[PDB]
């Protein structure tokens, strides 16, 4: 997959 910009939005 793709990693999100931030783990804890």
């Amino acid at each position, epitope marked *: 997959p793709l*990693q*999100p910009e*931030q*783990p*804890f939005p």
Partner: antibody, heavy 123, light 112 residues
Framework: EVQLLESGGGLVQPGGSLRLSCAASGFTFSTYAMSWVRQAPGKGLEWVSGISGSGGSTYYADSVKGRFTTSRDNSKNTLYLQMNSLRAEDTAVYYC????????????????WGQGTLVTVSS | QLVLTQSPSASASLGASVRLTCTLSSGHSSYVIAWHQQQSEKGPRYLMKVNSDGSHSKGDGIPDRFSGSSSGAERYLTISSLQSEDEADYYCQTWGAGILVFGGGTKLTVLS
């Protein structure tokens, strides 16, 4: 610059409760998510929890889910970890930490650690 | 599952250079990682970030001797001109959906 200072570590009986605090300074606290990381003696770093900048969303590792709670106060610039139903294997140094992610893009992409505080769960 | 693989130990000679390797599990080959240094009886110290184009975001006071690079699923920390103080545990760390993930850490021994 940024500073993170933990407090509240100590000795607790098995099944007991303990609350950790992390006083933050040097940045606008509410714009960053805040994390807890722990390290059992002689072992590696283990992620515990994360909480969004707004405090609207909390995240937990399976090893602590349902027993540990994390919160924050965005006026006192303080991050919290509330532990209940503590077990012997929760014995660790607990670090407060701030991981930035992908934005940022220079010095705002840095991460920061606290000094840690020791939690002992023992009879 | 998102996993970071580090060898437990590494060694090189005083004044020489060493390369530490963090490998992402398959399917996360574009992810950003961070390198953290932890000397004995001390808390971690952030060093830098490494994405697929190498790049950085070095922490304050991190020496030029420290650098990062990337190749495929592998992320590197290279320390040149090794000193005794470079003996430490080095952790790579990344993140996914609602998680952080740490490597097991590599213990660096500075020989000679």
């Amino acid at each position: 610059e940024v500073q993170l200072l933990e407090s509240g570590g100590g000795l607790v009986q098995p099944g007991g409760s303990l609350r950790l605090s992390c006083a933050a300074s040097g940045f606008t606290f509410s714009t960053y998510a805040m994390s807890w990381v722990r390290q059992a003696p002689g072992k590696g770093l283990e992620w515990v929890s994360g909480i969004s900048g707004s405090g609207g969303s909390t995240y937990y590792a399976d090893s602590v889910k349902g027993r540990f709670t994390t919160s924050r106060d965005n006026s006192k610039n303080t991050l919290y970890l509330q532990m209940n139903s503590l077990r012997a294997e929760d014995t660790a140094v607990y670090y407060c930490a701030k991981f930035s992610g992908k934005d940022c893009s220079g010095t705002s992409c840095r991460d920061y650690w606290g000094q840690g505080t020791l939690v002992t769960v023992s009879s | 599952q998102l996993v970071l693989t580090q060898s437990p130990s590494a060694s090189a000679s005083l004044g020489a250079s060493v390369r530490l390797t963090c490998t992402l599990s398959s399917g996360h080959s574009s992810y950003v990682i961070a390198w953290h240094q932890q000397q004995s009886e001390k808390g971690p110290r952030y060093l830098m970030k490494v994405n697929s184009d190498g790049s950085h975001s070095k922490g304050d006071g991190i020496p030029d001797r420290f650098s990062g690079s990337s190749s495929g699923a592998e992320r590197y920390l290279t320390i040149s001109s090794l000193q005794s103080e470079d003996e430490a545990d080095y952790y790579c760390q990344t993140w996914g959906a609602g998680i952080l993930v740490f490597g097991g850490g590599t213990k660096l021994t500075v020989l000679s």
